[model samples]
Target: QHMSGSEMRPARAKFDFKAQTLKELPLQKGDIVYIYKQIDQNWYEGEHHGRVGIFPRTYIELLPPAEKAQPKKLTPVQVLEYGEAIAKFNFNGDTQVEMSFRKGERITLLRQVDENWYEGRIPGTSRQGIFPITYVDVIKRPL
Candidate 1:
């Protein structure tokens, strides 16, 4: 049957790149990444981050579709308990002013991206709504 463009096909959900697992990745040095596609059956696995570096796709296997990777979020109690100064900053409550931070400020966790950021939020919340990295020093996590 002849069909109009609208009737020609059913609307399909666009396949956005959502990482399914920590496996099957063409990981860059220091960056965890996923293989998106193999170009022309070449020796490299195209990673999700747009880099086409050389890697063997033969060892690449799509992880079970159900598994998703995530960093464990720290509880408020854990944050507060570890918030205590570690002999460097005194117990006095004088906060270091970064002079650069403002609401909606975007900054990366220096040398660490575990649990998202050491101090920050997803935005649009009261001061207490999201943890601020300035509130405490961050500890790196082992992968």
Candidate 2:
């Protein structure tokens, strides 16, 4: 789930763009591109077909590189008290529910509220929410 600086990944054009200036890259809907470098959170250097140029990051979804697709590893600092979701609970409620998860998802349990919900973080992602206690089984600490 982590990517190195030198790695380039494929991305799909989400919208068509006709560059007004030569500095911007022109993109057609569904055009395949390889993102080689990220200029910033909002921009990236990409190659569309055989043409290379800079483009807006919002125009495409960064896909995991097929050759290096692997599960993410947790660093020592991330080894925290957590829980494993035993069942999938799809959030279909108010926008207040900040995150959602599926079966077998690992999360760092943060706080306990009554016997109904637990505040937790989805380990590798920036998603945190109050999930139902019935959906997760807290992991016991090792002695």
Candidate 3:
């Protein structure tokens, strides 16, 4: 028998944030989500299947109901660091600066709050950036 558990889904995607409209928000739209680029208070909007949508800061109603409303405790693990002693191709500054890691670099994930803005220290670095969670792959988590 195929027992489809709450964790199972036919639409298999990790952190899938694609859509086309405001009404098509697969998840919640606007509550208190922590975004990476803080320049604009506006959260990202997406559209899917001819529907418009927006990312939610707090809860997604369609998703399985959570036992309780609480902060996501990020799982920290030791892994290869990113942007270690490396110069950015576009920008240049101290390695201690936040948001240092580039795409596809392995990082020791410390914690995650929302779609973006993760708390982690760069490999061989002292400072941490509450950077966009999209930058690094949650290697340990996805289980």
Instruction: Give TM per candidate.
Output: 0.19, 0.40, 0.27
- Candidate 1: list runs displaced more than 4 Å: 1-32, 40-44, 48-51, 67-143
RMSD of each: 21.1, 17.1, 23.6
Q: Which ten residues in a row have the lowest lDDT in candidate 3?
A: 5-14
Model 3 lDDT per residue over 1-143, tens place: 58643342112112445446644356333322322222224444333344444554222322244578687665576445433222223322354445554544455566567765656665665546555554444655421
Error of 2 at 33 (Å): 0.6
Q: Sorted on lDDT, highest at the top, how do the candidates line up?
A: 2, 3, 1
lDDT of 1 by residue, 1-143 (tens): 57633311111112223234454333433343344444446443444455434344343433324354656665655442112211112223234422223333333332333453343321232222223344444343322
Q: Which stretches of candidate 3 lie over 4 Å from their true place?
A: 1-97
How many steric clashes between backbone atoms does each model show? Answer: 2, 0, 15
| Candidate 2: 10-residue stretch with minimal lDDT | 84-93
